[model samples]
Target: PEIVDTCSLASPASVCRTKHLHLRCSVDFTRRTLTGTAALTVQSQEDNLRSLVLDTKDLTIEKVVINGQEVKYALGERQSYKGSPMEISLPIALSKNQEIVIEISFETSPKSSALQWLTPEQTSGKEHPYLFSQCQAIHCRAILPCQDTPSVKLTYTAEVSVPKELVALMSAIRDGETPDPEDPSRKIYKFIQKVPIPCYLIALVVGALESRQIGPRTLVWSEKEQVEKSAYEFSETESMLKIAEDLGGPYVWGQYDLLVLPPSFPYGGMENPCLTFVTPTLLAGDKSLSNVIAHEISHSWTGNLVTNKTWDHFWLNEGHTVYLERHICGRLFGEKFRHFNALGGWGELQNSVKTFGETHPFTKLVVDLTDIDPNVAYSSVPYEKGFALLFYLEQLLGGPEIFLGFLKAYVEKFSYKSITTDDWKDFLYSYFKDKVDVLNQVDWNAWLYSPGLPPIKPNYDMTLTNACIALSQRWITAKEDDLNSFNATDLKDLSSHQLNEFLAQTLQRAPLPLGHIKRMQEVYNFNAINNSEIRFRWLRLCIQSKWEDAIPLALKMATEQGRMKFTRPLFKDLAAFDKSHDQAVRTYQEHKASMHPVTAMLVGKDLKV
Candidate 1:
């Protein structure tokens, strides 16, 4: 029997498993839609299969066909978040293991949450419009009709047509492109992915884009204006990939390209198979924020390869990735740096626990998605709390080398497959049969099911953390007379990451006095710092102090980028301030149209607008 995935409406792959997909779509720039056909090749898993089900949201179904003959299909009642399930009745019941093709003709809605259509003005070039997709969690159905769950993995080939002058790309190998014979003003781009991937990994983007080769196997793509800047920022892509391969197994995805999305691209990065989508905010000029790239690269093995069977097991994807990412950092920077990053993650986990309240189920390592949108439960819990568990296990199970051996074995066993936490635990026992006593002593329930911080914290190397805390304390308890003692030289020796830690520590505590903030700002010149991490914390620190001048700057940062990691907290801080409450709501209202659907929706909830 298959485990029921309440987050997806599609029939279990055990009944009818999808093997491969062939997508033929035309991107309608003007209409802000995608008209296409999704040809899914599926194999019957049961003795006789009478129907196949797919998940879709706000999609206009044109027709369904099989072997050039039309087939009868029905659309189930639409449910909020889960969408409508499309069930196609097979003309004849097929025997077990029988393979057949089911082609679906559909058009995406202009308001599709998965696709973000940007006007020319919204892009840096200001000449051609930009279009991109964010399909993770559950948004893939809004773009294409498929299983839409992480359980089923399938290879895909795409033929996407866009305007002649624009370029189209996917999370797969770039086959080639040709002028559209049917329409002189359009061009058809082709792609192929031999490695089977979960539908959520299927990504697409079209824009007036250019690429600069950053590594032998990497190219940084963005609008012409930002292309070189992105190329410079991500110049270390090859180094990180090499470091990750040494840690994990190998970089299976042949080509690892990076796309610097417009300012409104919500997340720091989307690990979209071969082509990773990143945010423009990462271009900190000094490469201080490239750890996000390491995180995305680590996903090649954890998320893109060994997968989560359901949204509930999302930590299996993010947590493992975080662990590996820090390992890579440990190799390049130092073990202390790795512990520093982990310590920062611990702080983030604490903040998330407090933000959602200690009793919130979303704080659990494995969340419940039944009748609940996965998007609503998203936070640092999975990324950090999960990392904490892994770090604890690493120390308990004979340390890094031994735990890493298990991770490698886990990836090798589950590559190209989706699995639940139970499956992972089973393998963990199988790999360390002799260490059962050590594992049995762990508080399994509290670690996996409890709704709060991890049961135990790993002892982190605090050499660097101490410096940040000491600096934060100086400002936290400073008297007016002490302000004169703080000078620019105080921060001259701190690394960018230390500065970020200092700011993070300050934000977690009560707001500093308004005078202290002004003094710190003058001494540190945080206003002039281009690193997004520093800016985000600096803005919130000032706003939390009820600093009137910081209100506009905070609002500006919130509206400028759609990254939830930064934007949501900034908005929440602004809303918490009675003086800036109305202004915060107004700014979000004015910029809602430009923000990504997910970002805009969540921000609205934060402001109760």
Candidate 2:
């Protein structure tokens, strides 16, 4: 079966009028079978439609009706469409202003094949059938039928009937008060979302989950033990909502909720309005992971509310979300945290620029949205570069408030509409046309149209020395008595250029003071700690010193405790050094296998060979 391309037929600005969905599902977790029934109500646009298309899988639409009148429709061969390749469409003619209702019953393949739900052991021993859907990657058709694009925003009302013992969650607010007593294990959870949303944002979760409320918002957890942790981590949800409202106008969605899925979530988080899906990996069992919660919560305003029309303008969503992250983190954790995060993001962006430059020979700059590789799109360049770009814009605008006002206006103007890169440029130009110098400084075309990383001087020796000295002094002054005593405020006060200057200075001063080294040991226990950033700095210094004695220590650390975040660059530097100066590469080989999957994939043995 071939997939059909309907995207060209529909305008990016068009919207699906409204939709109603009713679904009944039964599952056999051990056998991995899913059986279900679905019904939908769809309203037509102004034109007297000739045909309608809906996405589906290996299933049958038993009946179709238009305004209570049975309509003749033809089923077509399956074809790939949208995010996921699974494309199935039905064509039906419609009269002017006519409403159509669809009724269909279908059975899904075993859990092994369905991306929408999985019954892995981590999700409750594999026999209980804990189900959750990640439609963003293109599995929505398997759950329901719809246009499935951001342009076709539609209100979704869902009724999910499942085993009485399990609780079902949907995209919108819970419609009722009481659970069914007759069949407590087999209950129906109904939801009605008044806001129009893309099909990818439509979500549902069914499992034995626990819930807790902090004010008007709710946090649902797959495990009872995680409820408290989730609640605490998400404690700032209300505050984030307030901040977003003040920045982007009132809370359009009114309230929000979070679902901490079992351990198999592919990403750290997915911002599906009212019901944000989060991975359990971030449940540090305490508030240590609140930054992630804050990141996702900020999306309620940026990515979720004002989404990108196309993947190319993904910067619109990610950039704005990251900016929101900076805003919220600064407001909640203070300026120091924000600056630390910003510098960290910038470092990542530089690395991404290098990686993308090396790998992507086919495209210069990421211009065409349609031609983007998913792999590159997911990397830090898209995120960190986008963040840096926005930060640059803020700097050019003179202050944060002006940039924020611009963002607020942008969001308000195109609240539910899809926007492209040019649209963004036009909007900015309209507001700042007088500031041609600043606009010219942006170099938007060069950034987007270029193929590789901008040239960065590899003045490592000087940079490393200067950065180490400054860091050592900061560590010494904070005193190792308490982790909280380490004040980041001093660092935050420095600008990006100032920070870079400090790094450059550190690199110039090769060997740091012994007193500073002793202070670092007291505070960080260099050999014992697993902090990624600290380990990265230590590895660089060790390599720079090239002390034959420290080589063994570096090898030991590399083998026993090196994290992927640190190991990639560490080994890369070591390998380059080895090539230039005959150092043994064998020592780092054992640790290479343990590197993060992405890093391992990038620097495989084949490269070494």
Candidate 3:
């Protein structure tokens, strides 16, 4: 049976599916626009189709051509988030398995929500401007018109024209750049992705780029000044890529490169096909934050290879990737570290469920995204909750060795294909044919449909967390006189992540005295920390505990880093405290323009200011 995705209005895959996209675009830094032609090769699923529908948002369509002749296309009325669909009239009808070329000459508006154009001052170099495209959820239409749903996978090749001084990088393998000798100001860069990928994975960045080889197949790309540290921070990229391959299948994307974008890149990491775009925050002068690399690397198999059919089944991409990330971490760091790391995720999942309420449909493993843009629906729920389901299955089906076999088979079975949660269920049952008792004992309906946290909570090893948990409890229960007894020396042996877990849990269930947070900050200098996890959580505690002085730092943190993981929560926590609510709005209004569209949308919705 075929799956139906309700979030998109572009009909079904049976109507048509994109096979290849020959994209040509020119970048204009002054106007912050990308103008060019997207010549799409669409394959028809059946001959019954009279028209083709493609996704586009805030794009100026100059003309539409079918084959060598011009064709009339109508732009449907634009919805709030889902853009107007381009309903192109067919010049002639063709048979079931036929393919045709649909060329669209278009230019993107500066207001196109998919882009974040940064000036030289906004970047590390502070000399050359930078431009990058983030087209997850439904933003790809803003860049070039196409079937924006993840349901379709297509190979793509791009010819991007950019300023001669800057370099262009895409999600495809780079074949180097050619200087436009005739014109001193322009360079034509080319790239090709042999493997088919969803339109959401189509990424490109233009900037003052430099690279350092970190592994046999991995390279680190960043601004000229930040390349060394970025390379060192993610130095484990090759080993992680190898580890993921040993567990899953081969890394089919050819090259696994990391592009450390400016601080304003919205997400912590985007698993763009060849080049993984990440925030500069990951370069914290240490490698502790590089697990983000492991997580995104795991997506090579789970997300880049086997993808979710729709936004509703986003967990299939994120959850599976996180589970694999933890598995890789378990192998690299240790079982206890992975277990402790997951403990933090479980807390996040609980918070997500609490925010959505137990019965909210978005809390379900398979959400209903009908008529809803996926951005607001986003949270830690998919990554953490989805990992919970897969983790439960890991134990329920006998542990990593047994589950490993299933995972390998699953990834190999669905390589370069998109699937829904139901498809996963069917595959699981089919694989565990003889383990019916194991399957029967599992609560399939509740696991899939239950709104809150998973009904089954495993007794995971809490060795590392025991220390953090005890210390947090001690801090919570300690008398004012005893508060001085705890200081920097106590957590000297703890990893940054462990420290983060302890600090995050310490402020909850009850607020600490402002003096206590001040002491904690003074003793440990947590407010001066570089690791994002620890700093963000510690800031949350300060806000809850009433630290007006921390407000300036919070604003700086909120404005500087665009990772939603940090910014959204920091803004919301600031707003939740009455004293800081108005200031939070003011800070958000001042800096929101610097954030990615997805980040701005969510934070704006958070404060309503």
Candidate 4:
């Protein structure tokens, strides 16, 4: 393992600084060649000279010139070395008020370190090939040469020279755009964004994409047949953009574009500025797949505009983006949609608790943390836990208005800049001083510094205990009067919104054992329950208690009313009860086959069979 030592002088430090960069890329899709040139201007606090490190893979370098003077550079001689990183040491020395410009040129191999996405049609008799860059882990050096760290920020100007048959999109919008009708094979699209961001967020996509104009500010793209669906799904982009402008001041980038890529994409979406990379899974031939679109659009404000300095601070980006997404969804859909969305987030929190409970290092922050593989960082902890924490923060902060104000302030203060966890905490504490109790209760430092899930005592209350006793008595008596007297209004009176409140009051307080589930099963006639919601809840409780005898009846209900909501839980519980149960698996598999592709994708099965 190579240990990368920090440089003495850079932007954030003299070794690292906050500065801007300009980039220009030229790609030939037919020959599968990628070439790029970058001009970086560094802002230093001290009058000292130092070397900078950038993560790169196999690529031929033509030249490295700094400040109009050539510098002596070495390979594999740095303090920290892993997977071919280049260290460009600036030969020329000191100055406090000086700017340095470095010019780098490289050619990417056909099957190079950069994994270029190629479609079957493109690889077939077709003349064009779709090529893009995945720089998330540490692949940016393969695409371009720069100080590849979160602390370094740069404004990019990209130009892709591809065949006229194909189109290209980058992270920024085109400047003074004009299509060259005469020479379609060669077109130069230039973009300039003032925001300072990390290299991984920089993206480039070249493919056979069919596009349609939604409005002056919105452009949607997808496969030919799915173009209409993409347009409808992205129809809310204009509205979102408008809302973002109202909330975040203005749209820094003039135009917003959505690109729906092929199904082979490993992740659901990548929130590249201006152009958002979406999976073809969202193209369900229907308009129900707009949630992801809302998510990517919200990234324009949080992830794209504010930007996290490093991976450890990824929660800064993801949490803010998730909060923005819920806000946008609430505005467009409804309050119910927003609340339902939060419930889904809470479910994820429960899953995180289970994960953290099972895994080691429960409280470690995700950013700046290296993985076992070294090359790839664990994403589940960063994405899921970060999102849940932000949702919890929203609940703690009272509502959306206060949360949005803090978020907007955080973005405005650090707009076009990189930040750490301390910066975020300071902002939170200063902004919400009145809510010190909540802030103190959160104990973010403990959460960040520790490893594994925090132990939360089950707080059972009397109301919930009463509700459970009433429910148990109703089940025990089995009298017609008990059934007749049981008012649905009483159940409705219970706080349905707060499941934690319900659990604390009822289940935790009740001293009933697993046998109680069997008694309830006998009285309720689990198989004869008519209400889907109640039956589903009862089935869930049964599964929680591990009522082996009730598994068969649960399976019966699952098979009978197997739709979107019940199918996943049914499949999961039945599989858990007996993985070798061929009948249960086969029945669920057949049900899955009849669902839509996107639904099937979410449920972890293909219905096409």
**Which candidate ranks first by lDDT, i.e. highest?**
1
What does candidate 1 score on TM? 0.95
Report residue 518 deviation for candidate 4 (angstroms): 25
Candidate order, lDDT descending: 1, 3, 4, 2
Clash counts per candidate, in order, are 0, 23, 0, 30
Where does model 3 exceed 4 Å of error? 1-3, 378-380, 487-489, 518-528, 547-552, 568-609
Better of 2 and 4 by TM-score: 2
Candidate 2 structure quality by residue, lDDT tens digits, 1-609: 121123322212232233556555555454444556666666665455555556554444555554454456554554433323222232555554556666655565553222445444335334455776666633565555555555456676665667766788877877763454545656667787887676667777777778888756665555564677777766767777777677667667755888877543434577888887875555544444556666677677676777766555566777778888788777776655566667656665665557556446322334453444322443345566567667777777776788888888888877876666677789888877778677776677655556554332111123323443576455434443533453445455553334433433343353444444444345444445333333445655545544343456555544443244444455555655554223436654443444333334444552363
lDDT for every model? 0.90, 0.57, 0.85, 0.60
Residue 119 lDDT in model 2? 41
User: What's the CA error at residue 291 for candidate 4, in Å?
Assistant: 2.2
Candidate 3 on 334-427: residue-level lDDT in tens?
Answer: 9888888788788888987898798888888877888667966755478998898888888888888899899999999999899988899889
Between candidates 2 and 3, name the one with more favorable lDDT: 3
Q: How accurate is candidate 2 locally (lDDT)?
A: 0.57
The weakest ten consecutive residues by lDDT in model 4 span 1-10
- Each prediction's RMSD over C-alphas, in Å, is 2.2, 8.1, 2.8, 8.8
The worst-scoring run of ten residues by lDDT in candidate 3 lies at 1-10
At residue 357, candidate 1 shows an lDDT of 92
lDDT, candidate 1, 283-362, per-residue tens: 89999987778989999999899999999999999999999999998998899899999998898888889988999888
- Cα misplacement distance, residue 77 of candidate 1 (Å): 1.5
Better of 3 and 4 by TM-score: 3
